[PDB]
Symmetry: C4
Subunit: 25 residues, 4 copies
């Protein structure tokens, strides 16, 4: 639904950002 | 409006993150 | 404040995502 | 909790975006 989709997209973005920061370190 | 713009930006960010994750895989 | 900071960070992230998508195209 | 985690992920994403923009400049 409109609430579970926005949540899922947010979690995906956060995971990608954390991975990128770990690569730069 | 102030509600549709923040939603659109969020969807754009999520799509970009998904694409990046697919490239890394 | 706690409301203007989260908004500013969100706009910054959206602009960065749009720029990245334009580079990939 | 479900409120502190979403906030933390958001801050992490914003910091990563700012760093990327600084590198492009």
């Amino acid at each position: 639904s409109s609430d579970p989709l926005v949540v899922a997209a947010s979690i995906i973005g956060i995971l990608h950002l954390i991975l990128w920061i770990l690569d730069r370190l």
